[model samples]
Target: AEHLLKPLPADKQIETGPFLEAVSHLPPFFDCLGSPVFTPIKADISGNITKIKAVYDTNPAKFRTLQNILEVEKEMYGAEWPKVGATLALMWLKRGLRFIQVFLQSICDGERDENHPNLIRVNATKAYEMALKKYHGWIVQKIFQAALYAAPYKSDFLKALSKGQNVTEEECLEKIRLFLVNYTATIDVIYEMYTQMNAELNYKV
Candidate 1:
């Protein structure tokens, strides 16, 4: 809990610095899955973080809030704003975050396949379908199908979440529930910012 996402402000405006700090903690979680199949997903997320951070680094004060970045870029790039620059990076980044959020939430909610309770295929599928599927073309979808088969067992995943400390599953889940509070809110605010600004792109990647 100490290093988890910071609480949002009263206005729910996500500061670029803190937002980056929080999300940077997530990509490492992919390493715990122990499969090469997840490497591209991890790379995609890391690339977006780098893209957004590069923009934010130029003028921290000017891009203090995530909304500010979008606003500035909207003006700077005219028609190409959202699709180019950090806007597009964040657009895709948020989807990846959504995938993690939904997958973790599903596990915490105890949604599982009775036949293969230890396997996380059901939860992973739900997350992928909800988050990345729409943006993915047929080839990417097939890639996801392959990765699903490589998913770690639920027990191993929970253990990874605990940082290999040997905590019980329920204990880890409780911590995850707490972490999701601010994490989910941050992601939601970003999504709403895109929609409110009419900056959302629907093109499949």
Candidate 2:
């Protein structure tokens, strides 16, 4: 007994029309993830501030918690679990790594303060590790740690960096750049595939 979706208030109506229009034209099977209005590490890391942070941070309504999705996980995973995984991974990466990038740039560029480089890095690492804890329980958290903070994605560099790696600002930014290119491109792909589904979740969020 599903009812027809109710209409939005006049004010909120305008916000959704374009989004609906945008996705209605897509093909039945989603595959090609074209460009989105986001920057990877290769591009300038900072924009008007909104662009760099996770959509969930600035706009949590746009993101649904995994707990609700878990309600249907067993039923849904067989069909779309992989896509969900992709989205979560990107979300975690973008959330933490971007924070690091912003923090580093703020300190290095003298926007925040240049005097306490080690203090900044140490605090950043602590923040990064703390955020990681929320994504999983004790066990799976390690796996995420490996993926986002342990390997070639510049986690090691960031880790070593805090411990006095003695790298120049240019080199530090380069590490951040390499990471941005890797994660942000895939984020666009995830959005392309799940935009419609995620949009529908706003009411639930």
Candidate 3:
């Protein structure tokens, strides 16, 4: 902490490198093993990434939120089922996973230096991802666990990162929000990390 971040005593310095760096490095591939995560999220057609695209053969209690989200989505967007499905279907047109796509896109986009709490604090969006992966065991473990189940040879984040492109902060946040629900158990860490980062930035600016 003191060595890398160089924060004062009783203070913890976050190293936000991995995830931040990974942002530009994110890819757009969705791989589900042991279970499925599509077809249950609320489908708003306009939501782009919030809609769940498929169903699962094996059910886990962990996805109770998913089931509930889907039912509500149906009713909410039910007014336009075909439309909703069409948008979702098209978004996933290549049968590509949008959730995976957005994560990587966030990296390349650089996100909003002022808006994203994580990047705002570390003064680097990529650094924040790395910090969370490093300091928070829960965050790192869950991501690793999910990685094991990923298709034998694929990296959504990495592929996108290699491209080194840029998008918008809105695009990045929207994707991060979606990834938290669909890909990882990282909302709390993300929120906390960003909040702390922003607080520090505010302290200086």
- Root-mean-square deviation per candidate: 1.5, 16.0, 18.6
lDDT of each: 0.87, 0.35, 0.31
Would you estimate the TM-scores of all the predictions?
0.94, 0.28, 0.19
- The positional error of residue 178 in candidate 3, measured at the CA in angstroms, is 22
Candidate 1 residue pairs that clash: none
In model 2, state the lDDT of residue 59: 39
Say what the RMSD of model 1 is.
1.5
Give Cα distance to truth, residue 95, candidate 3, Å. Answer: 2.4
Off by over 4 Å in 1: none
- CA error at residue 197 for candidate 1, angstroms: 0.7
Candidate 3 Cα outliers beyond 4 Å, as residue runs: 1-25, 28-47, 50-64, 85-94, 98-205
| Candidate 2 C-alpha lDDT tens digits along 107-187 | 344332246433344433444454334544665544434433322222343444433466665676565455444233433
The lDDT leader among the candidates is 1
